[PDB]
Design a binder for these strands. Structure first.
Ligand SMILES: Nc1nc2c(ncn2[C@@H]2O[C@H](COP(=O)(O)OP(=O)(O)OP(=O)(O)O)[C@@H](O)[C@H]2O)c(=O)[nH]1
Ligand SMILES: [Mg+2]
Lengths: 259, 89, 132, 144, 55, 205, 154, 60, 483, 154, 57
RNA sequence: ACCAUGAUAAGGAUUAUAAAUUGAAAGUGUUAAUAUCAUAAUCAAUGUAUGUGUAGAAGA
């Protein structure tokens, strides 16, 4: 495939799974985006002929409820469906387990790199986790060796969709005794969050990060911005910003010109 | 012998250069002592050719000569890439 | 003189950090060969023992880093087209990170090394003590 | 083949004394004779003159003989021929008939062999007769 | 010597053993074939198959 | 690309083609050889004197005979719990976000030394506490009537609280003094929460 | 030694980025191995550097495939870990080269370049006949002639 | 910080001086109207900044 | 496979056995075999090294069957027999802690037997005369790095272990191509090399203390100048000590007298066999690079513009002083050409360490120059015409000697702990190394040593890569079968 | 938090040492020496008054206040701003058991009781004996403070 | 982390980064920059006799 | 000489089912901003100091 100003992965994603791609495949004249031709048995079964349901027909319904009301059942089986069944491609192969190992991430989010709301929620979560960690369900408590566990902090995302509990052990040899038991608690932790902290942007997904002092933090937001302003190329930045202003004023003139 | 002088003297007794000249024999499962060779240079003459590009050219020449002497040697040599020509200037 | 960032920092280690270019020669090797021959024929082994001590102290196998521990410690992706800024940062970073501070190199009496002899006694210079 | 440097380094910028580079025109490149040094052409010409000087001095130190001009009669049979001047004919073999395939121009005669024609006036052997070892005699080498 | 070193020979990245061959960055870049390439190499045919065909 | 001009057979530049035939033949030979061939509890201890010399504590009671006792014996309230003997020093190391405390108690609950006060904080506090405690243990045992004995290390029960960084440093500090303090039970004291008293608003909202 | 001019330091990373050009130049590595062998000590860091560079040079023309992308990132983390391990072995051998070369120069009574430290002889920078008339860093007047670090007898 | 404020202001004055342009002083339709409203609401601030720069209504 | 912990060191008996290193270094470089014995129980296990160091034997113990075999000499014996050193490149292979190996070639055996006869020459005089064809000794010639210096070192070893007076002259360039030349104090028209002379006197005295101490000086004035407290010399050892032990510059003029009288007395002696071994006899034969001083420095001057002398204006080239005019070489030649002295045997060798020249020559860059300490002598040399000794021609190693020498080099280096060691799997096997180094060196000895060192650099050896690949695949399929 | 009472202690101790040396000089009846000591005391007071105000809210400042006030009173400086600040700080300075004793398993052999006689630290919370994490947490100098409670649970 | 070039000792220059590891007698680099800004506030004197008046020329 | 040149950045689809070859590549196809002198009557030019540049080379 030919990729221009975009990655080949994203290019194929757009040309396979997309509104204009699907419309062109169903046979609707669109120009800017095109579907991939002649994929044999490789095109998604959703868009194979004699399967799924026609989007050219589905354009006729203005609402999802109306589509549900008036849209006839899909054809259960097809030739491409038989090929997918023969190849075993009716359900993707299971990837390696990620719910029983820690996140070996690149950086470690800085205390100044998170919104104040996320920061607030984080210290509350850390307080309650440290207070209640011994009152975990008995069938996990009986095997967790609390003598070794340590939790440095909890970081989480902006608006706390995700929480990252940074933990390690006194002796490094205990990480592989402690990790699975710790990952068996990610539901108990969510219930603790629901029960104890009342100002939560929303109940998050819990993820454990092992950092025995090995990982390295990020730079402060202000220091990073100062470094960027200090070393950035002034000529290119000025030209780009002037072009941006030119485009903004052009759009404003178009808006004012349309009566 | 390269241009009337022993290889150890032409390539200035450099192990990493003469082993390329040896490579076509080893890849072919052959004994270098069963064959005696002479390499003549038609390129830009220089006082010393003790460099990797010259060694590459010598290895390619030896490999081609071996191929034409005994055709069945062309199997391991092409697979090893001694018959392939680099295009870099 | 004009102050610069070429400070040698002689305080630490046997070699001044950001060390000056050091170039060896075959004449140096010949002089070393003659010096070693004369020392071996005169029986002086104190300098050999000191050389082995330095080799043992500074020639251990570096510890395999643990995941997450990376080599630059600084993004180095922000100096976009600022090659001189990147070069100054690299000079200063490698000047700060000194061999005395090279934690990942096991060095000191706390280390055990079955590869090299530690006590100058168990060397072939002392071979009549080994004969029961 | 020679491993010594023949060309002068190019000047495209000011170099420094670094790990893999040295200052241009330092007292290390051509034996310290760069202290005399502009134009790459004239600099290369001077370096060529120095290289030719080195070639000449080693070529003359390699020379251990002398070119006494001997009359035709008092001369070995191999040199009793007509010898073309240098670069006039094919490199001449001394005598293919007697299996002596060797450049006649490079032949060197031991001085203790022409005492019969050199120094004909001195009735005493200024140079004692040359001692030649016997090949057909059991010696330490031939004993095993 | 070679037959003993064959069993002493390391196979994991450890102490003085390490995959500097781009296997971590590039992966398996060296081919390795279990079949004799017809004109050059030879391995005797298996006797189970020989007997099957003869029978 | 920078190396677009080099051949694909030189990109990896395969080598050693002369070994493949040998490997195939050797594999077949070893398969034939295999077909032809086809056709942890701990150590043992036996002597009582040896056990005593090896472990530093005699197994046989070797004490006064209190024979002819009652025919039924009462159990301990906590049978399964570890056997804390009289001469064990119980040191508690409590960690927090900003601070770390270390105290040491006698087998009877008597405090030996006052409290002392991140990872480095805990390490230093513990090291200083141990250094100052060893002499205090000397004097307390001497007053009791127990001489140290040359090289006899104090038997220690270390108990840690707080899921904070300082725990690693404090335990490393206790470990660094192994030659004098012999840790026999390392355990945790982080309390099980209950209804408990009210908590600050900042924790909740 | 005959390189007695004031010099410029270079970070070990940029020294090692040369690789086959100068850092791992085979002739230079061979004569470093010869120095170590004559001194009578094992060339283990040197051999680690040699095999590292051989295997890297064996692939330097291969472009890595575009990574599909794994959230766990264990693959990228391991790749970086091994890269940094190799870099650290090369740093160790780099430091060893300088250390033993200065030791040998001190042994053979060879004067180093300006602002070079020899542990036994000149702890601070040795400066002899520099363009700047005073110490480059200590701001003191160097004597005429340059200080003799060693004795006079040959 | 000096370079940051310079890099922030100089584009405005340079555009004003050199790059300033000349001046001469039903459900589907409803959903399209909504999408246009959405884009303009998302980019309200910088469009207002551009119009203010054009109209010279900005407090330095 | 971890048979290292089960390995117990053998009993140390010699310096060679003491050269052994911790098992962690040579585990795998020298794999350990296991031998089961039935001693006081059917099962036993003795983990032993497959390879052991070559034996440390004396020249007397060396035999005919040892030809093309490697032996060793203890460090103490080395220091005893070589105070002056090991001329040439022979000590290149003997760093501190390394065994001091030595090949035993056919020429080495011939020389050992000849020295055996020299030990009692007066009875074997006819045998010696027939062996040398009547010439006063042998001169060893051959290509570069061929082993002439090693053979002379072995000859000196043989003679000094048999307790005969030996005049060993390593690196005859120290004499001919010395540092500075000085006219002889007592020999008019003859020149000296005082530094080399004093060093030679020291080393000769310490080497031959026993015989020199037992010596009695016959023709030597006993009124030699002497400082307070020093006893006048009475034996040749004390003569050498008086010559070389003195304060500068008083040693410069004393060494000339000492060497002149030592040469005179050695020429006089007619009973003790004296073996004279010199490395590079061509240097003593043709010339020394020193030139005669310009006569202006001798005549004397009043003012410079007066005589219009150009000594400081233009350099010149005075005739080179021939090596015959030195006092040491004068004694040697006096003893050589003058008959009636069947008591001194000259086992000399030539040298070929000259700088290379092949038609053109630039300037060798200082940092990368393996001929930096080579000799500026491009003139040819023919031993038969340029010397009175019987010439012996040596060539490069034949496959037998080459295999033995490379086996010793590699295996003993790794055993002593200076080779690949734990990284043995990074290097090919001994057969591949032998084949490749033979190709690269032509079985030349010096080339073999150089390429043994350069083997660190080989980049086109895929044997270990393919071996690891095959063994990993075999193990993986075995585990998959087991599952 | 990388704050060192080094220089503040160094300044204060000099003031106290001069304060003592002044009594000693007056007892020796050396008028010139005591006048010089008084002059130097004023000189050092002027340079010390800024270190005091910057560090007046530190623990180390809380303990030398009365001794420094005694020094100033001995020197008879009663209108000094530092005297007034010392007066203010000194003025501010001057102004649940369980039904049945039970022992947790984590305090098995003999629970360590901080005998009720000893008073717990100034800023600390006296919690019920039932809702104690552990008797060590009710230890007097380990007792949770209010601000420490706001941050960590136990 | 690495505290070998973190702080600036007043004695040394700004580019001559100090090798000292102590903390007490050091000022941070932001403070060094502020001090240099507050210190470089003087003009080199303008030569009066060196250059002649434009009207004179 | 007052013509309607033209540079500048921006849009894109097509092609490996081979393990051969010294080499497994090139064809193909888009919006703005900027710019446009020539059918006419001439004329010798302590306390202390950091640059851009130039030459070689988060797919909200
Ligand atoms: N141990 C040992 N080494 C040998 C022997 N023969 C040659 N060599 C090696 O060869 C190297 C060079 O020494 P020689 O071959 O004797 O040198 P040469 O014969 O004087 O020839 P030139 O170098 O031209 O003067 C030495 O470093 C030895 O290690 C031998 O018989 N035994
Ligand atoms: Mg020699």
């Amino acid at each position: 495939i030919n990729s221009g100003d975009q990655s080949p992965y994203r290019y194929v994603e757009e040309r396979l799974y997309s509104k204009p791609s699907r419309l062109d495949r169903e046979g609707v004249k669109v120009n800017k985006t095109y579907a991939l031709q002649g994929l044999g048995d490789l095109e998604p079964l959703r868009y194979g002929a004699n399967f799924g349901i026609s989007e050219k027909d589905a354009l006729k319904y203005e609402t999802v409820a109306e589509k549900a009301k008036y849209m006839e059942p899909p054809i259960p089986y097809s030739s491409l469906a038989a090929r997918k069944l023969a190849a075993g491609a009716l359900w993707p192969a299971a990837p390696d387990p990620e719910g029983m190992i820690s996140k070996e991430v690149r950086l470690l989010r800085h205390e100044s790199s998170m919104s104040p709301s996320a920061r607030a929620f984080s210290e509350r979560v850390a307080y309650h986790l440290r207070r209640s960690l011994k009152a975990c369900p008995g069938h996990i408590a009986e095997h967790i060796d609390f003598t070794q566990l340590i939790i440095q902090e909890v970081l989480g995302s902006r608006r706390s969709k995700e929480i990252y509990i940074v933990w390690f052990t006194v002796d490094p040899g205990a990480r592989f005794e402690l990790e699975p038991r710790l990952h068996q608690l990610n539901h108990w932790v969510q219930q603790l969050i629901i029960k104890r902290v009342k100002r939560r942007p929303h109940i998050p997904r819990v993820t454990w990060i092992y950092d025995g002092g090995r990982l390295e933090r990020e730079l402060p937001r202000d220091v990073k911005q100062e470094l960027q302003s200090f070393v950035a190329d002034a000529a290119t930045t000025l030209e780009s910003r002037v072009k941006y202003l030119k485009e903004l004023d052009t759009m404003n003139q178009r808006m004012k010109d349309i009566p | 012998t390269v241009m009337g002088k022993p290889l150890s003297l032409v390539l200035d007794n450099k192990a990493w250069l003469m082993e390329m000249v040896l490579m076509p024999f080893d890849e072919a499962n052959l004994d270098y002592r069963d064959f005696d060779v002479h390499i003549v240079s038609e390129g830009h003459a220089m006082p010393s050719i003790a460099n990797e590009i010259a060694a590459f050219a010598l290895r390619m020449a030896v490999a081609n000569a071996l191929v034409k002497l005994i055709p069945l040697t062309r199997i391991p040599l092409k697979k090893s890439g001694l018959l392939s020509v680099d295009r870099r200037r | 003189s004009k102050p610069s960032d070429n400070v040698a920092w002689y305080d630490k280690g046997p070699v001044e950090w950001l060390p000056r270019p050091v170039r060896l020669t075959y004449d140096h090797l010949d002089q070393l060969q003659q010096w070693m021959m004369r020392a071996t024929l005169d029986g002086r082994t104190e300098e050999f023992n000191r050389i082995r001590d330095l080799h043992r102290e500074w020639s251990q196998h570096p510890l395999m880093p643990v995941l997450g521990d990376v080599e630059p410690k600084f993004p180095l992706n922000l100096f976009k087209q600022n090659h001189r800024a990147k070069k100054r940062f690299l000079v200063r970073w490698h000047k700060a990170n000194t061999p005395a501070n090279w934690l990942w190199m096991p060095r000191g009496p706390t280390v055990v090394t079955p590869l090299h002899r530690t006590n100058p006694t168990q060397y072939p210079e002392n071979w009549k003590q080994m004969v029961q | 083949v020679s491993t010594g440097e023949f060309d002068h380094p190019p000047f495209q910028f000011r170099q420094r004394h670094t790990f893999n580079t040295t200052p241009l025109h330092d007292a290390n490149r051509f034996g310290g004779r760069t202290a005399y040094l502009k134009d790459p052409r004239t600099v290369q010409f001077n370096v060529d003159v120095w290289c030719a000087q080195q070639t000449l001095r080693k070529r003359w130190k390699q020379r251990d003989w002398e070119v006494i001009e001997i009359p035709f009669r008092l001369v070995p049979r191999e040199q009793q021929r007509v010898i073309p001047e240098l670069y006039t004919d094919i490199p001449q073999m001394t005598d293919p008939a007697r299996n002596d395939f060797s450049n006649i121009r490079n032949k060197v005669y031991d001085r203790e062999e022409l005492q019969g024609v050199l120094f004909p006036a001195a009735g005493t052997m200024l140079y004692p007769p040359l001692q030649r070892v016997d090949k057909q005699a059991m010696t330490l080498d031939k004993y095993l | 010597e070679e037959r003993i070193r064959e069993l002493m020979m390391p196979l994991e990245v450890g102490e003085n053993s390490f995959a500097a061959n781009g296997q971590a960055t590039h992966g398996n870049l060296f081919y390795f074939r279990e079949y004799p390439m017809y004109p050059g190499e030879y391995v005797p045919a298996e006797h189970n198959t020989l007997s099957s065909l003869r029978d | 690309d920078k190396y677009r001009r080099v051949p694909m057979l030189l990109k990896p530049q395969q080598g050693g083609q002369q070994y493949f035939n040998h490997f195939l033949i050797r594999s077949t030979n070893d398969r034939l050889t295999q077909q032809d061939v086809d056709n942890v509890p701990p150590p043992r201890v036996l002597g009582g004197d040896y056990f005593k010399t090896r472990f530093g504590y005699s197994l046989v009671k070797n004490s006064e005979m209190t024979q002819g006792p009652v025919d039924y014996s009462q159990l301990d309230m906590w049978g399964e719990m570890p056997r804390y003997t009289s001469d064990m020093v119980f040191l508690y190391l409590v960690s927090r976000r900003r601070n770390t405390y270390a105290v040491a108690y006698t087998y009877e609950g008597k405090r030996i030394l006052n409290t002392y006060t991140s990872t480095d904080n805990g390490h230093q506090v513990t090291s200083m506490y141990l250094n100052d405690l060893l002499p205090k243990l000397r004097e307390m045992r001497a007053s009791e009537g127990r001489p140290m004995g040359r090289g006899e290390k104090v038997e220690l029960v270390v108990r840690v609280m707080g899921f904070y960084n300082g725990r690693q440093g404090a335990v490393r500090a206790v470990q660094d003094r192994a030659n004098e303090f012999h840790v026999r039970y390392f355990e945790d004291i982080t309390p099980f929460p209950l209804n408990g008293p009210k908590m600050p608003r900042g924790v909740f909202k | 030694n005959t390189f007695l001019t004031s010099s410029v330091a270079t970070p070990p990373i940029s020294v090692i980025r040369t690789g086959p050009k100068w850092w791992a130049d085979p002739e230079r590595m061979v004569r470093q191995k010869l120095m170590y062998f004559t001194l009578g000590v094992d060339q283990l860091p040197l051999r680690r550097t040699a095999v590292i560079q051989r295997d890297l040079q064996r692939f330097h023309m291969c472009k890595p495939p575009p990574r599909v992308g794994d959230s766990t990132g264990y693959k990228r983390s391991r790749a970086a870990q091994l890269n940094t391990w190799y870099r650290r072995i090369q740093y160790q051998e780099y430091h060893m080269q300088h250390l033993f070369t200065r030791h040998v120069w001190g042994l053979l009574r060879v004067y180093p370049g300006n602002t070079t430290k020899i542990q036994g002889k000149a702890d601070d920078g040795y400066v002899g006949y520099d363009s700047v008339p005073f110490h480059r860093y200590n701001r003191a007047p160097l004597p005429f002639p340059a200080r003799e670090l060693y004795e006079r007898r040959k | 910080l000096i370079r940051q404020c310079l890099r922030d202001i100089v584009p405005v004055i340079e555009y004003r001086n050199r790059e300033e342009p000349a001046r001469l002083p039903k459900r589907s339709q409803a959903k399209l109207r909504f999408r246009i409203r959405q884009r303009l609401l998302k980019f309200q601030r910088q469009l207002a900044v551009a119009n203010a720069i054009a109209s010279r209504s900005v407090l330095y | 496979k971890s048979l290292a912990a089960m390995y117990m060191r053998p009993p140390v008996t010699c310096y060679t056995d003491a050269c052994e290193a911790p098992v962690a270094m040579w585990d795998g470089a020298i794999p350990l075999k296991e031998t089961r014995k039935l001693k006081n129980g059917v099962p036993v296990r003795t983990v032993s090294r497959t390879y052991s160091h070559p034996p440390q034997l004396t020249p007397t113990q060396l035999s005919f069957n040892d030809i093309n075999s490697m032996y060793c000499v203890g460090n103490d014996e080395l220091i005893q027999f070589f105070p002056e050193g090991l001329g040439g490149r022979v000590f290149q292979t003997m760093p501190p802690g390394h065994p001091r190996g030595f090949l035993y070639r056919k020429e080495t055996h011939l020389l050992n037997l000849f020295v055996d006869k020299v030990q009692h020459w007066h009875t074997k005089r006819s045998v010696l005369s027939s062996l040398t064809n009547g010439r006063t000794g042998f001169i060893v010639d051959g290509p570069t790095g061929c082993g002439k210096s090693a053979l002379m070192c072995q000859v000196v070893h043989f003679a000094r272990s048999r307790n005969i007076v030996t005049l060993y002259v390593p690196d005859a360039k120290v004499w001919t191509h010395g540092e500075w030349c000085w006219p002889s104090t007592i020999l008019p028209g003859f020149f000296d090399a005082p530094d080399a002379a004093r060093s030679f006197l020291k080393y000769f005295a310490v080497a031959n203390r026993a015989t020199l101490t037992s010596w009695k000086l016959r023709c030597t004035p006993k009124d030699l100048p002497t400082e307070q407290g020093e006893r006048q010399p009475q034996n040749l050892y004390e003569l050498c000590e008086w010559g070389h032990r003195a304060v500068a510059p008083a040693s410069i003029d004393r060494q000339s007298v000492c060497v002149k009288f030592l040469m005179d007395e050695l020429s006089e002696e007619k009973k003790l066999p004296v073996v004279i071994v010199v490395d590079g006899w061509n240097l003593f034969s043709h010339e020394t690079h020193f030139r005669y001083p310009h006569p202006d420095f001798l005549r004397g001057l009043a003012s410079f513009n007066e005589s219009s002398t150009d000594i400081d204006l233009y350099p010149q080239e005075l005739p080179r002083i021939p090596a015959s005019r030195l006092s040491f070489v004068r004694g040697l030649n006096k003893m050589i050409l003058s008959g009636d002295d069947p008591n001194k045997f000259f086992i000399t060798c030539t040298t070929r360490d000259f700088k290379p020249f092949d038609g053109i020559s630039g300037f060798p860059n200082v940092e990368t120059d393996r001929f930096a300490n080579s000799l500026d002598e491009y003139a040819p040399y023919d031993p038969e015409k340029d010397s009175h000794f019987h010439p012996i021609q040596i060539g490069n190693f034949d496959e037998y000697e080459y295999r033995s020498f490379l086996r010793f080099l590699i295996n003993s280096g790794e055993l002593a702990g200076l080779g690949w060691g734990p990284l043995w799997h990074a290097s090919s096997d001994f057969e591949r190394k032998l084949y490749k180094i033979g190709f690269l060196s032509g079985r030349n000895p010096q080339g073999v040593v150089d390429h043994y060192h350069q083997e660190l650099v080989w980049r086109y050896d895929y044997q270990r890569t393919r071996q690891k690949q095959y063994l990993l695949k075999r193990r993986m399929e075995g585990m998959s079968r087991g599952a | 938090s990388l704050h060192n009472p080094g220089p503040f202690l160094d300044g204060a101790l000099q003031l106290i040492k001069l304060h003592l040396a002044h009594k000693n000089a007056a007892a020796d009846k050396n008028t010139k020496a005591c006048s010089d000591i008084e002059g130097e005391f004023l000189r050092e007071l002027e340079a010390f008054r800024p270190c005091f105000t910057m560090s007046s809210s530190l623990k180390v400042a809380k303990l030398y206040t009365k001794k420094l006030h005694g020094a100033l009173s001995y020197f008879q400086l009663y209108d000094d701003p530092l005297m007034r600040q010392l007066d203010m700080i000194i003025g501010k300075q001057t102004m649940l058991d369980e039904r049945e004793e039970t022992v947790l398993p984590s305090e098995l052999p003999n629970p360590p009781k901080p005998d009720p006689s000893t008073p717990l630290r100034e800023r600390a919370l006296k919690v019920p004996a039932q809702h104690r994490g552990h008797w060590v947490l009710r230890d007097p100098d380990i007792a949770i403070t209010r601000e420490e409670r706001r941050t960590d649970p136990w | 982390g690495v505290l070998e070039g973190a702080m600036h000792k007043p004695g040394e220059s700004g580019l001559q980064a100090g090798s000292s590891t102590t903390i007490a007698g050091k000022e941070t680099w932001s403070q060094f920059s502020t001090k240099m800004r507050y210190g470089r506030r003087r003009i080199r004197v303008i030569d009066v006799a060196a250059k002649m008046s434009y009207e004179y020329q």
